[PDB]
């Protein structure tokens, strides 16, 4: 929003860049930070860990009722079956959208998000506009921001991740996908459908 007090984005970026390089130089001299360590972190979350991993769980649950049971009882242990887990998803609890219940996830106090299945959160998830309003007016927020209308009679459950427990939405399988392959169904599973701000893709 407009703030007559705020420098330009370019002036802000220039300042942050200098400050970060200066801090980086100091930690390098302390022997605790290296360029290879920076590169590895960035490679993992740019190309290795992403919402494609969460979609694999979702499509397995959609096509394997026994796995779905296990996923809903202990999410960390279930995802471990597919080789998925680790940092910031050590404790994972999956919640299933149904005809009566819609789930949406938030972290009002900061930014908590299930990295092993979704990768790093998009900036809007971490920012104050989404975090402040979704606990208070979830139904309106979903319709205005994401064009997602949830019927008044359907209950919306907002999960505020105040702990190290991580909540992940299992979206409902779209109609019209009988007998689809696991690859074919994954194209319908979006980051947004596992946060609960959108359904899985139609058609």
């Amino acid at each position: 929003t407009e703030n007559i007090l705020r420098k330009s984005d370019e002036e802000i970026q220039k300042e942050i860049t200098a400050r970060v390089k200066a801090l980086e130089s100091m930690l390098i001299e302390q022997g605790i930070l290296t360029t290879s360590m920076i590169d590895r972190m960035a490679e993992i979350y740019e190309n290795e860990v992403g919402p494609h991993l969460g979609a694999k769980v979702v499509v397995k649950a959609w096509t394997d009722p026994e796995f779905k049971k296990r996923l809903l009882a202990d999410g960390t242990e279930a995802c471990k079956e597919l080789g998925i887990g680790g940092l910031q998803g050590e404790d994972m609890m999956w919640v299933e959208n149904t005809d009566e219940v819609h789930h949406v996830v938030v972290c009002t106090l900061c930014d908590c998000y299930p990295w092993p299945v979704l990768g790093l959160p998009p900036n809007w998830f971490k920012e104050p506009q989404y975090r402040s309003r979704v606990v208070r007016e979830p139904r309106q927020l979903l319709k205005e921001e994401f064009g997602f209308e949830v019927p008044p009679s359907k209950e919306i459950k907002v999960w505020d991740s105040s702990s190290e427990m991580r909540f992940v939405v299992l979206p409902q399988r779209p109609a019209g996908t009988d007998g689809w392959s696991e690859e074919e169904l994954a194209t319908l599973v979006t980051r947004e459908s596992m946060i609960g701000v959108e359904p899985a893709k139609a058609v």
Binding site: T1, K21, M41, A42, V135, R136, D160
Partner: peptide, 30 residues
């Protein structure tokens, strides 16, 4: 901020990179 009013509409580019600048990779890795 939970329950706070008046913070603004959500800003949500149709897409955006994991890291928007090199300095972000550094901050993350630190």
């Amino acid at each position: 901020v939970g329950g706070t009013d008046g913070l603004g509409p959500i800003n949500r580019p149709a897409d955006e990179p994991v890291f928007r600048a090199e300095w972000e990779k550094v901050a993350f890795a630190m």
